Design a protein around this ligand. Structure first.
Ligand SMILES: O=C(/C=C/c1ccc(O)c(O)c1)OCCc1ccccc1
Ligand SMILES: [Co+2]
Length: 163
C-alpha cells in the first residue's frame, strides 16, 4: 500500500523514533509499504517517521549505473548505531519530507554502523560517498532532525526565501 508522506513543517518529523523489538509480519508489511511509497515518489531513502511510524528503521536504495533501482540492492536498516565516523565533506541533499528543496550539508565522509535487518540479523556496514550521506540523513530522521536544520547562516535564508 501507498503511505502518506509527512512534510515539513509537521512537528511529527521532530519525533524521536523507538527501537524495534518485534521482527514480525507486521514489521515486514510496514517495510514493504515504505518501499512502495519511496519508489512511487522517486526517493532513494525513507525513514519510518516520514510515513508517521515512529520506529527506528529506514530504507535506502541507490540507483545502479543505468539509473535503475533494483529491489535486491535495498538496505533495510533497523536499530542503527554508529560505530565509527570519519572526515568531512559537503553534499547536496534533498528529502521527500522537504520536497523541491536542495542544499549542501556537511556530513562525515565515511561511517561505520551496526544495525539489524528485517530478520533481526545483526550487520556491520562501512559506507562512503552517497551511501554514507544517505545513512547519516536517514538516521538523523530517527532523531527528529531534518537536513535543513544543518544549513549554514546563508542557506536557511535561501530555504526560507524559497518557502
Ligand atoms: O530520497 C530522497 C528525496 C527525494 C525527493 C523526491 C522528490 C522531491 O520533490 C524531492 O525534493 C526530493 O532523499 C533521501 C535522502 C538523501 C538525500 C540526498 C542524498 C542522499 C540521501
Ligand atoms: Co529525508
Amino acid at each position: 500500500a501507498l503511505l502518506e508522506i509527512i512534510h515539513y513543517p509537521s512537528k511529527i518529523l521532530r519525533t524521536i523514533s523507538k527501537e524495534v523489538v518485534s521482527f514480525d509480519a507486521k514489521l515486514h508489511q510496514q517495510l514493504d509499504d515504505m518501499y512502495e511509497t519511496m519508489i512511487a515518489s522517486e526517493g532513494i531513502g525513507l525513514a519510518a517517521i516520514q510515513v508517521g511510524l515512529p520506529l527506528r528503521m529506514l530504507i535506502i536504495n541507490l540507483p545502479q549505473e543505468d539509473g535503475v533501482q533494483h529491489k535486491e540492492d535495498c538496505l533495510e536498516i533497523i536499530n542503527p548505531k554508529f560505530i565509527e565516523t570519519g572526515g568531512s565533506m559537503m553534499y547536496k541533499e534533498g528529502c521527500l519530507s522537504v520536497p523541491g528543496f536542495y542544499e549542501e550539508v556537511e556530513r562525515f565522509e565515511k561511517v561505520k554502523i551496526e544495525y539489524q535487518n528485517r530478520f533481526a540479523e545483526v550487520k556491520v556496514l562501512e559506507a562512503s560517498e552517497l551511501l554514507a550521506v544517505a545513512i547519516q540523513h536517514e538516521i538523523d530522521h530517527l532523531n527528529g532532525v531534518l537536513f535543513v536544520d544543518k544549513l549554514s547562516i546563508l542557506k536557511r535564508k535561501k530555504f526560507e526565501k524559497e518557502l
